[PDB]
C-alpha cells in the first residue's frame, strides 16, 4: 500500500499495454524504462494536483483537481469534470 508498489504496473501488464500499440516483440529492458516514464508523468501530474489541493484549502484530492492539473498541459478534451 505504501512500500514498493511501483511493480503494480507489472511486466505482463506492460506487455499487454504494448500489445495495444501494435508491436510483436517487447524487449526485457522495455518494462522498467516505461515504468520510469510512467513514474515521471504521474509525479508531474500529482505535484500540480497536490499544490492545487493545498491552494484550495482542501485536505482531500478530487478528480477535478487532477483535471485542472492536466489542464495546463494544453489539450483538455472530453472526460469527467471537463
Amino acid at each position: 500500500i505504501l512500500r514498493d508498489n511501483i511493480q503494480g504496473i507489472t511486466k505482463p501488464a506492460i506487455r499487454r499495454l504494448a500489445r495495444r500499440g501494435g508491436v510483436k516483440r517487447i524487449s526485457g529492458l522495455i518494462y522498467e524504462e516505461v515504468r520510469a516514464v510512467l513514474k515521471s508523468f504521474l509525479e508531474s501530474v500529482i505535484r500540480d494536483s497536490v499544490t492545487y489541493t493545498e491552494h484550495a484549502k482542501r485536505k482531500t484530492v478530487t478528480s477535478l483537481d487532477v483535471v485542472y492539473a492536466l489542464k495546463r498541459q494544453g489539450r483538455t478534451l472530453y472526460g469527467f469534470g471537463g
Partner: protein, 40 residues
C-alpha cells in the same frame, strides 16, 4: 451508449482527431492500428 461509441465518433471524424486527441478518453479506449508487416 458505451464510451466505445464516443471513441468511434471521435476517431472516425477527421476534424475531431485533428483538433485534439491526447487527454484521456473516458473509458472509450482507443483504435489500435496494425501494420501489414507484422502478421504472417
Amino acid at each position: 451508449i458505451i464510451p466505445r461509441h464516443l471513441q468511434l465518433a471521435i476517431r472516425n471524424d477527421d476534424e475531431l482527431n485533428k483538433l485534439l486527441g491526447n487527454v484521456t478518453i473516458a473509458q472509450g479506449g482507443v483504435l489500435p492500428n496494425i501494420h501489414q508487416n507484422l502478421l504472417p
